Amino acid sequence: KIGLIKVRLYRPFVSEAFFAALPASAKVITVLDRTKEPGAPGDPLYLDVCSAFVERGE
Amino acid sequence: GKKMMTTDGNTATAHVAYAMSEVAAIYPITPSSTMGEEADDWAAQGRKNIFGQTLTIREMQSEAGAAGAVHGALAAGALTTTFTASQGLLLMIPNMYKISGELLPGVFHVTARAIAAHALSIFGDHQDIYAARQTGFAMLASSSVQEAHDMALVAHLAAIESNVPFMHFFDGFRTSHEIQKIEVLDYADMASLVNQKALAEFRAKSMNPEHPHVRGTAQNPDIYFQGREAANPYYLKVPGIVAEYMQKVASLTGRSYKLFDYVGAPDAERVIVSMGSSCETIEEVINHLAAKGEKIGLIKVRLYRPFVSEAFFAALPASAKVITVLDRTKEPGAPGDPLYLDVCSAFVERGEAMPKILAGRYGLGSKEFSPAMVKSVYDNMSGAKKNHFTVGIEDDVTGTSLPVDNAFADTTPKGTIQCQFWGLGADGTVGANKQAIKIIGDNTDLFAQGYFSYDSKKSGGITISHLRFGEKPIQSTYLVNRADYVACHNPAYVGIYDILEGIKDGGTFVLNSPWSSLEDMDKHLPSGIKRTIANKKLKFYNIDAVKIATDVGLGGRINMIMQTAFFKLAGVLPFEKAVDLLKKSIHKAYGKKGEKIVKMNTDAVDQAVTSLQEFKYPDSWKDAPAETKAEPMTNEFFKNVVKPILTQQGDKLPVSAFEADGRFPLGTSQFEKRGVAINVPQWVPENCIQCNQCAFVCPHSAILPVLAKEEELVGAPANFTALEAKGKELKGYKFRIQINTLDCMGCGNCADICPPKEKALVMQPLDTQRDAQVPNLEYAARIPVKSEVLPRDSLKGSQFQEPLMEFSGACSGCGETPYVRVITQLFGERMFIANATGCSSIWGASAPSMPYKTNRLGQGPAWGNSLFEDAAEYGFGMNMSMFARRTHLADLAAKALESDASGDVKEALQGWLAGKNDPIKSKEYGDKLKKLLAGQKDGLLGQIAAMSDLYTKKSVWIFGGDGWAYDIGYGGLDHVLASGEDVNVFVMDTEVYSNTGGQSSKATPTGAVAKFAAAGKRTGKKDLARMVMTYGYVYVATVSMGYSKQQFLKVLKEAESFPGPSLVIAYATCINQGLRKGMGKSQDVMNTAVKSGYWPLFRYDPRLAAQGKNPFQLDSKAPDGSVEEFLMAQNRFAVLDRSFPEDAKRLRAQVAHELDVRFKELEHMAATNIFESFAPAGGKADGSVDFGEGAEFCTRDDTPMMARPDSGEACDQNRAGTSEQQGDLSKRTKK
Amino acid sequence: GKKMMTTDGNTATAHVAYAMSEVAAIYPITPSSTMGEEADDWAAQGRKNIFGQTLTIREMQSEAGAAGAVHGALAAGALTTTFTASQGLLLMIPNMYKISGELLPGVFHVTARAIAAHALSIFGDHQDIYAARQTGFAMLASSSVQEAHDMALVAHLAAIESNVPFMHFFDGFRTSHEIQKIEVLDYADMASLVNQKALAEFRAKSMNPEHPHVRGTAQNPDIYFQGREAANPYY
Amino acid sequence: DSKAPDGSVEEFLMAQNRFAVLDRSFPEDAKRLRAQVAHELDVRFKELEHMAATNIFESFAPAGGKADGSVDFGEGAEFCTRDDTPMMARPDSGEACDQNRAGTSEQQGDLSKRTK
Amino acid sequence: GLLGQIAAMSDLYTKKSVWIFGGDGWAYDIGYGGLDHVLASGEDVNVFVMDTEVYSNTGGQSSKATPTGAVAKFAAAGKRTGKKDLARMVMTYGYVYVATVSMGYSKQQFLKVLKEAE
Ligand SMILES: CC(=O)c1sc(CCOP(=O)(O)OP(=O)(O)O)c(C)[n+]1Cc1cnc(C)nc1N
Ligand SMILES: CC(=O)c1sc(CCOP(=O)(O)OP(=O)(O)O)c(C)[n+]1Cc1cnc(C)nc1N
Ligand code: SF4
Ligand code: SF4
Ligand code: SF4
Ligand SMILES: [Ca+2]
Ligand SMILES: [Mg+2]
Ligand SMILES: [Mg+2]
C-alpha cells in the first residue's frame, strides 16, 4: 500500500489541491527535496507540505 | 572597558566591523552607505583595528564586484567584511554560495531593505535578507541599536571560530538610522575574545603559492552530492558557538542573549514570534498589557540560520495555546512566509502538542508597526484568529488586514517625554535635534532616542523629528504619536499639515511665526488649530525666530532660537542646567570667528529665553468658526490619491487605491505648486530681446514663453504685459515671458543668463510677485503653444514647444533637469525612457509626484525604471519589442498591398512602408492610415487598424547618471551600444554618485573630493567617450548647455537621427560639487567647464566617414587657461586646498596637465586621415549554418557541455596529428 | 494536429517557446544552451510563431542583461521568453521581482541545475529554481520529456491569461537531455488556445508614448505596503 | 610589434571552417564579409601606426601620496552640498545652509542693496 | 613576541604575483565591467585573456570578441558586427600596461610581454 503525490504547480502552492491528492489512509509521508539549504530547519518542499498539515489542523 | 555613546545602528555596527576586519570591499546603497563611509573616514583618521592596522577599504563598480573581492580577500586569508542591502545584497547572492560553500569567515552587515518589485523602496523590511536564506550564511538579527553592536561582535567572533560566514542584519532606517544612547566595547575587549587558534588556522588554510591547493573545482554527479554534505559538521556546531560568544560578550557587557529569547508572562497563552526592531515595540506592549493580567509573551529570534528548534522550544511557554509568527516580508504564491514556515516545521517534527499557529505580515518598506498594531495581533489570537493576515494597512481588496484601534493607550515607560519637530529643509532643525540628544545624553542618566522622517522633495522639503527621553530604556521602535512637546519651525505648515495630531492634553506647542499680536494670530492661525489649543489646554508659545535671529545678527537663521525653546520648554532638563549646557556647547563648537560669532549665538539664547512667554489666547478659540475650503480645480487622481499622500495621509489610503502593477499616471506634478522659492525672477519687458534662453535653461520649467495673436489676449489680465514679437516669422504676434512663481525654485540661472547688460530678469521676493503672476500664469497656460511657427530644433523655437517634464523634485538649479526638459521638447511625444536608478529616477518618479506629462494630444514619454544596473538592457528590450511588433505590422501592410484593399489605403500603406523608420513620413502616412482604416475591425485591415500606436517611428532613450554609465551599468551599456541598434543613451554626468550622497565614481576627476576619494581622487576620470568611439559605428558626443545651447540641440538632432546607437554625455552641475556662488551659476560653470578645456565638446558621427569625411568633429577651443579658477570655484576642489594645500596644488596641476594632453589628443583625432567605414546593414538572407558543418576535424569536444541533439557523428579529434602529418605517415607506412 | 517525434526535453520545450513568443533575450549556460540555439537557428531559418512572424532573438552580455532586456520587451508589449539555469538564473533574480511585480506575462524555461558552492556543477537539481521561489514567479515543474512540452505550453497560455510570469522548469540533463518518443502539437493548435482578449489587453497596457504611464516609481512607507499587496487578486 | 597586413588575410579566413562554411552556404554574403574584415584590419593597423607615430605622451603617474587624513566634500561649502532626502542623511548632517532657493550670491547681495 | 609573529608570517615574505585568467567571453562580455574597474584601480594585478573569439566551453557561442563574418551560435549567418577593440579601450586609461600576443608569430615577443606586464 504505497503512493506518490506529484507536484506540478509548486508556486503558488495550493494546499487544497495538495490534499485533494492525499489518500486519507496515509500514515507516513516523506517529502523529497532535490536541494540543500544549509542551516534551514528543512528544505523548501518539506516546509511547504508541513505548513499545509499544520493549517489543516486535523 | 565599556563606554557610553549616543549613535545610530549603522555606526554601532561599523564601530565593531572596523575593529574586527582587515579588508572591506564596498559599494553605496541606502541605507547602509553610512557604515562604509564611516569605515573610510576612520581609516583616513588613523583608527586601528584589533591588529593595530588601518582598514584596507576599496570601492568596487557594484555589489557583485564587492562580493567577488570579499570572496577573494577571505580566500587569501584576510578577515573581510562589507555593508549592503536590498538590490545590493541580491547582487551578492552568487558569491554568498561560494563564500559559505568554501567555509570562509566572512561577515556581511546588512540594513534590511525592501526589494524593488511594483516600485522601488529604500526603506526597511526583510525581503532582502530572506532572499539570501538558502546561501548557507548564518543569519543573526539585532532588534535595536544596542543589539546591533552586540550582535555585530558575536557575528565576527562566531564566523572566525565556526568558519561559517555570517549575515548580521538590522532593520533599514528603523534601527540603522535610529539614534540611542548605548554602550560599546573597547577594541581591546573585542580582541580578547578572538579565538587565536581558529584565526591561525584561517591564515594557514588560505590561498598561498608557498603551500597551494585548488578551490572551485568542477564536479560530476559521482561526487558533488558528497562534497555538498561534507560541511554538515560545521553547521551543526555554529549554534553552540554563537551561544558561547553571546555568553562571553555578556560577561563583558552584562547583556545576555540566547538564540531565541522569551519575554512576557511565564504562563502566557498567546505568543508572538518576531524578528528585528518589531520585538522592542512588542515587548513594550507586553510590559503594559501583562501588568493588567494579560497572559501574553514574545519569542525574539536572534539566530535565524541555522534555525535550531530545540532553542526555539526552550523559549516557548508550554501554556501557549495560540502562536502568531510575524514575517516582515511577502513571498507571492508561497503557502506562508519564511519564519512562519520554519516554526510550523518545528511543531511538526516535535510530533506532540500542536497549538494554533497563525501567520501575519507587517512593516513592509518601513510601514509603521505601532503598539496599537501589536494590540491587534494579540486580540486576533483571542478572537477571530484570522490567518495569513496583514497589519498596518487596510486591505479592502482581499480582506487580509487586521483592524487597528488607534485609540490604544500610550505604552511608553512612565516618565518618558516625547517630542516632535516640524522643520523645513536646510533650516538646521535636524542638526539641532542631534546636538540636543548628544548634550542630554552626555549630561544626564536619561536614555535618549531620535528618529527623523524626511521628504522625497530634495529642496524646501519637510522634515519631522521624533525624540524621546526617559529614565527607563526606550523600546519605542515606532514614531511618536502622542507628544508632550510639539514644535513647528515653519509657519507655512500651519495651513497645510496636521501639526497637533495626538499632542497630549496640557502638552506644549511652540510655533515660529511673525504673528506676535493676537489679531495676526487669529488671522493666520486656522480654526482647527485654535480649537485644539484651547480644548486641550495647551501651553502655546509663539516666537518670532526670524526677528530675534536678525536682531542678534544671525541673519534670520532660526536654529539656535528653536533649540533654546526646546531646552527651556521640553521639560527634559531644569532651566539653569539646560541653559549653561547649551551655552557651553555653543562655546564648544564655533569658536572659529572668535567670540564674534559665539557672542551672537549666546545672545540669541538669552533673547530667546526672555521672549519665550505663553501666548494668552481667548476661550472663544474653543469655538472658532469652521473655516470654508477655497479649493482650485484638479484631477480626480490628484484629489483622491496624490493630495492625501502629499499631506502625509498616504497611510490611510487602502490597497484598492493603487494599480496592481504599480503604475502611476503622468503629469501629477502639474497641481503641486509648492511655492518654496525665497526669490523668483521678475520679467522686465523693456530690457527683453525675446531670445527664450531663460526658459531653455530653467531646471524646473518655471518659465513659460508666450506667443499669442492679438485675438488670444482679449480677456488678458491688465498686468499681462506683452511685446510686439521680434523676428520676420513672428510679425503680428505678441511675446511675453511668463514667470511661474509657484513652481520656480529660486535658483537664479535664468536671471544670471539673461543676455542684456540691463537684465530683463531680476530676482525679487516671492511675496512681491505671486499676487500678480499666479493669475497671469493661469491665463498663459490656457494660451495655445505655437509649436508650428519656428523650427522645433532651434534655440528660440524649442521653447515654443510643449515641455513634457515639469516641476520635478530635483534640487533648485539642478544641472540634470534642463537637459531632459529640452529633450522632451524635441522628441517627447514619441519617446520611450528606460531610466537608470539615481537622481534622475528620484526627481523623475518619486510617488506621488510625476513630472513627466503628456502634450495636448495625450502623447508623452513612456517612462520606466527597472533597476540601477540594467538601464541600457532595459531600453534595449523596449527597442526589441518595437522591432518585432513594427516588423509584424510591416508584414501585414505588405500582405494588405496584395489584396483588394482600396487604392487610397494601398497608397498610404506603401507610403508608411517606405518611411516606416522616418519620424516625419511614418507619421504622415500613419495618420492617413488612422483615418482611412477608422472603424475597420475585420480581417487584415482590422489587425492593422488596431496597431495605430506603432505607426510613427518611436525614439528609444536610455537615461542615466555617471555612476550608472561609467560603473555598474557600463558592461550593459557597452553591450547595447555594440549591438548597432537604434537606441539613444543620454548620460547626465555629475561626476559623482549624487542621489546616494556624493560617492566617487570612475567619472570623478583627479583631485575632486568625494566619498571614498576624501583626499582627492588619485586616478583620472575614465574616458567613456573615447572608449565607445573605438567601435566606429556608434554616434558619440559631449555637450554643455552653458557653453552652447546650439551645439546641444545640434547634438540631439544628430544623435537621435543616427540609424544606430548614440551616446551623448552631458556636463551636469550638482549640489555635491559645491558651486561657491550658488547653483544659480550652473550655466556659467558649464560655460567655463568647456572654455577652460576641462570639458571639451565634440561629436563622432559615423555617417561622415561613409562619405569620405572625418567622423570626429571638435566643437570647442583649446584650454583658455582658466582651469585653476574653475576648480577653485567648487568646494569639491577648494576644500582640498584648505586642508591639504600641497597635495591639492599638485592635484590641480595634474588636472591641468591631463586636460592639456587630452585636448591635444582630440585635435590629433580631428586631423586624422583615417576614417572608419559605416554601413547600417546589407546582407542577412534567410537560413542558418552551424560552425561545424563540413569541418575537416571535430569542432566540438567530448564534454556534456557541448553535447547537442545533432552531435555524436564520428570525426577526427586531432589525436593523430595534422592532415599532412597523417598523409606523410600513410605514405611512410606503405602497404 | 498531433505530431510524433523523438527528441529531448530542451527541444520539446523550445518547440513550444518559439511558437508562443515574439521576443527572446538569451545568454548561454549548460544545460539550457540548446533551447536558445534552436530558437535562434529556427528564426534564422524563417520559422514562424503563432503570429506568423519570425522570432526576434538577441544575445546579451550576461543573464542579468538578458533579464533586463526581457523586462523591457514585456513592458513594451511583446511576448517574451528566455532560457537559463543555475548561475544564470541567479543573475536574473533582481529583474524577476520587477517582472512579477509589474505583472508581465514573461516565461522563463529553466533546466534546473546545481549552484556553485564548494564546487561548480553543470548537473541537475533544484538548487537554482528554489533560489528564485520568492521572486513572485509562478513555478510549474515538468517531470518527463513529454511533460516538458505540455507544461511549457500551459506555462505560456497561463502567463498570458493570468499576467503572472511563469518559470517552467525541468531537471538539467535527466530531462533536458534525455531523449524520448513523444507527441507534440502543431503551432496552429497552440494558437487556438490563446486568450486573444488577454493578449490584446497586454498590448494595450504596455509602454507607448501614444498613451503613456509611469512605471517603476520610488515609494515611501506611506504607500509601499499597500502597493505590494495590490497584486493579490492576480495570484 | 608586428608589420603591416601582408595580404594573406583571405587565405587565413578560408583555412578556418568558421569562415569557410559561410562561403559554402551564403557565397555572396561571405565574400562581402571577408572583404569587410580585410578593410577593418587595414584601417585598424593604420590607426596603430598612427599611435606609434604620435608625440603626445601621457605623463605616467605611479601612485603613492595617500596623505594621512581626509575631508568631507561639504566642509566649508558656501551653499548646501546635500539635499533633504533620507538617502543623503548622515550622522553629522542637519546643520543649516543656503539651499539655493534665494538666488546666486551676487543676486542676493544685489537684492539686499536694493532693499536696504 | 614580535619575532614570533614575524616568523609565523613567512608565507608573506616574498612578493607574490596576482593573476586573473579568463577567456574572451569573460573579458569582453560578462566580466567586462569588473575587469574595467579593476584595471582602472591602478593596483598591481595581471590579467591574461585567452581570446578564442567565441564562448568555447559552452559550445561556440558568439561573444563581442567574435570577428565580422565568423559563424558561431547566435551568429548563424556570420557575425554582422566587428570585433570589440578591448585593447584600445583600456589603453585610453594611460596608466595600464596593455599588450597583445600570439605565440606562433613570436615566442620572443610573448616572453617580453610577460616580463614587462608582470
Ligand atoms: C535609489 C537607489 O536605490 C540608487 S541611486 C544610485 C546613485 C547613482 O548615481 P549616478 O551618478 O548614476 O546618478 P546621480 O544620482 O544622477 O548622480 C545608487 C548608487 N543606487 C543605490 C544602489 C546600489 N546598488 C544596486 C544594485 N542598486 C541600487 N539601486
Ligand atoms: C562551466 C560554466 O558554467 C561556463 S563556461 C563559460 C564559457 C566562457 O567563454 P570564454 O570565451 O570566456 O572562455 P572559453 O571557454 O575559454 O572560450 C560560460 C558561458 N559558462 C556558463 C555561465 C553563464 N552565465 C553565468 C552567470 N555563469 C556561467 N557559469
Ligand atoms: S530662478 Fe531657477 S527655477 Fe526659477 S524660473 Fe529662474 S531658472 Fe527657473
Ligand atoms: S533671457 Fe532675458 S532677454 Fe532672453 S527672452 Fe528671457 S527675459 Fe528676455
Ligand atoms: S543631480 Fe545633484 S543637483 Fe540634481 S537632484 Fe541630484 S543631488 Fe540635486
Ligand atoms: Ca540613434
Ligand atoms: Mg552622478
Ligand atoms: Mg572563449
Domains, in order of start, for chain B? 1-257 (3.40.50.970), 258-414 (3.40.50.920), 415-626 (3.40.920.10), 627-667 (4.10.780.10), 668-784 (3.30.70.20), 785-1169 (3.40.50.970), 1170-1231 (4.10.790.10)
Say if strands B447-453 and B179-185 run parallel, antiparallel, or are unpaired.
antiparallel
Determine which helix (DSSP H) or strand (DSSP E) holds B523, and give its type and residue range.
helix B518-524
Q: What is the DSSP string of C58-70?
A: EE-SSHHHHHHHH
CA dist B330 and B153 (Å) reads: 30
Closest CA to B133 of B108, B162, B159: B108
Residues with CB under 6 A from ligand 2: C 27-30, 62-63, 87-88, 91, 122; E 22-26, 50, 52, 55-58, 63
CA dist E65 and E54 (Å) reads: 7
Nine-digit cell string for B1: 572597558
Q: Test E42 with D34 for CB contact under 8 angstroms.
A: no
Q: What are phi and psi of B467, to 5 degrees?
A: -115, 145
Nearest-by-CA chain B residue for D84: B458
Residue identifier of the C-alpha nearest atom 2 of ligand 3:
B747
Picking from E32, E64, E73, the nearest residue to C37 by CB comes out as E73
CA distance to B207, B933, C199, per residue, from C210 (Å) = 59, 18, 19
What are the residues whose beta carbons fall under 8 Å from the beta carbon of B1105, sequence distance 6 or more? B1032, B1111, B1171, B1172, B1173, B1174
What are the residues whose beta carbons fall under 8 Å from the beta carbon of B864, sequence distance 6 or more? B832, B833, B834, B835, B874, B878, C72, C75, C207, C214, C215, C216
Which of B98, B302, B305, B344 is the mutation pick for testing A, counting most A CBs within 10 A?
A: B344
Query: Is E60 annotated as a binding-site member?
Result: no
CA dist B934 and B908 (Å) reads: 13
CA dist B370 and B845 (Å) reads: 29
What angle is formed at CA D73 by the lines to CA D70 and CA D79, rounded to 5 degrees?
Answer: 145
At residue B271, the 3 state secondary structure works out as strand
Query: Residue B1193 carries which DSSP code?
Result: S
Nine-digit cell string for B167: 549575515
Write down how long chain A is: 58
CA dist D106 and B89 (Å) reads: 46
CA dist C22 and B880 (Å) reads: 10
Write down how long chain B is: 1231
Check if B463 is active-site.
Answer: no
CA dist B416 and B371 (Å) reads: 15
Nine-digit cell string for E51: 581570446
The angle that helices B338-350 and A44-56 make with each other, rounded to 10 degrees, is: 70
CA dist B363 and B464 (Å) reads: 20
Which of C113, C139, C151 is the mutation pick for testing A, counting most A CBs within 10 A?
A: C139
Sign for the CA dihedral angle at C51, C52, C53, C55 comes to positive
Check if B30 is active-site.
Answer: yes
Check if B995 is active-site.
Answer: yes
Is the Cβ–Cβ distance between B879 and B953 less than 8 Å? no
Nearest-by-CA chain C residue for E29: C61
CA dist C94 and B796 (Å) reads: 44
C: neighbours with 3+ CB pairs under 8 Å?
Answer: A, B, E
From B80, B995, B1004, B1088, active-site residue: B995
Check if B712 is active-site.
Answer: no
E13 close contact with D: CB closer than 8 A = no
B621 close contact with D: CB closer than 8 A = no
Nearest-by-CA chain B residue for D99: B426
CA distance to B112, B825, B954, B968, per residue, from B853 (Å) = 34, 11, 17, 29
Nine-digit cell string for B804: 513634457
Nine-digit cell string for B842: 528620484
**Residue B376 carries which side chain, given as an amino acid letter?**
S
Query: Residue A9 carries which DSSP code?
Result: E
Closest CA to B470 of B401, B514, B410: B410
Name the residue of B817, B1071, B1085 whose CB sits within 8 Å of the most ligand 5 atoms, as the mutation to test its pocket: B1071
- Residue identified by cell 543589539 is B147
Nine-digit cell string for B1148: 590641480
Q: Test E109 with D1 for CB contact under 8 angstroms.
A: yes
Picking from C130, C171, C235, the nearest residue to A44 by CB comes out as C130
C-beta pairs of B1153-1156 under 8 Å, 24+ apart in sequence: B1153/D59, B1154/B1006, B1154/B1020, B1154/D58, B1155/B1092, B1155/B1093, B1155/B1094, B1155/B1096, B1155/B1119, B1155/B1123, B1156/B1093, B1156/B1119
CA dist B495 and B608 (Å) reads: 25
Distance B720 CA to ligand 3 centre (A): 19
Distance B968 CA to ligand 7 centre (A): 12
Nine-digit cell string for B160: 572566525
Nine-digit cell string for B230: 561534507
At residue B55, the 3 state secondary structure works out as coil
What count of Cα atoms within 13 Å lies in the side-chain half-sphere of residue B42?
Answer: 23
Q: Which residues of D touch E69 (CB under 8 A)?
A: 13, 19, 22, 30, 33-34, 36-37
Nearest atom (ligand 3) to Cα of B813: 2
Number of H helices, E strands in chain C: 9, 9
Alpha helices for B219-308 (secondary structure H): 224-229, 232-253, 278-290
Write down how long chain C is: 235
CA distance to B535, B685, C66, E28, E57, per residue, from B978 (Å) = 70, 50, 15, 11, 23
Residue identifier of the C-alpha nearest atom 8 of ligand 5:
B811
Closest CA to B334 of C235, C162, A54: C235
CA dist B29 and B25 (Å) reads: 13
What are the residues whose beta carbons fall under 8 Å from the beta carbon of B334, sequence distance 6 or more? A11, A12, A13, A48, B341, C133, C134
**Residue B140 carries which side chain, given as an amino acid letter?**
L
Structure determination method: X-ray
CA dist B333 and C101 (Å) reads: 12
Distance E55 CA to ligand 2 centre (A): 7
CA dist D60 and B410 (Å) reads: 67
Report, in this order, helix, strand and coil percent for chain E, each rounded to 5: 35, 15, 50
- Residue identified by cell 516538458 is C148
Nine-digit cell string for C144: 518527463
Picking from C45, C64, C209, the nearest residue to B829 by CB comes out as C209
Chain E closest CA to B40's CA: distance in Å?
17
CA dist D85 and B173 (Å) reads: 13
Q: Is the peptide bond before A12 cis (omega within 30 degrees of 0)?
A: yes
Any atom of ligand 5 within 6 Å of the Cβ of B994: yes
What are the residues whose beta carbons fall under 8 Å from the beta carbon of C180, sequence distance 6 or more? C6, C7, C8, C144, C145, C146
Label residue B1113 exposed, middle or buried (CB < 10 Å: 0-12, 13-18, 19+).
middle
Is the Cβ–Cβ distance between A41 and B307 less than 8 Å? yes
Bridge partners of B5, per DSSP, are B182
Residues B14, B18, B24, B26, Cα dihedral to 10°: 20
Q: Test D37 with E68 for CB contact under 8 angstroms.
A: yes
Say if strands B270-274 and B296-301 run parallel, antiparallel, or are unpaired.
parallel
Any atom of ligand 5 within 6 Å of the Cβ of B1070: yes
Nine-digit cell string for C220: 515611501
**Residue B1081 carries which side chain, given as an amino acid letter?**
K
Nine-digit cell string for B799: 521653447
A32 close contact with B: CB closer than 8 A = no
The angle that helices D17-25 and D27-53 make with each other, rounded to 10 degrees, is: 140
What are the residues whose beta carbons fall under 8 Å from the beta carbon of B945, sequence distance 6 or more? B929, B930, B933, B934, B935, B936, B937
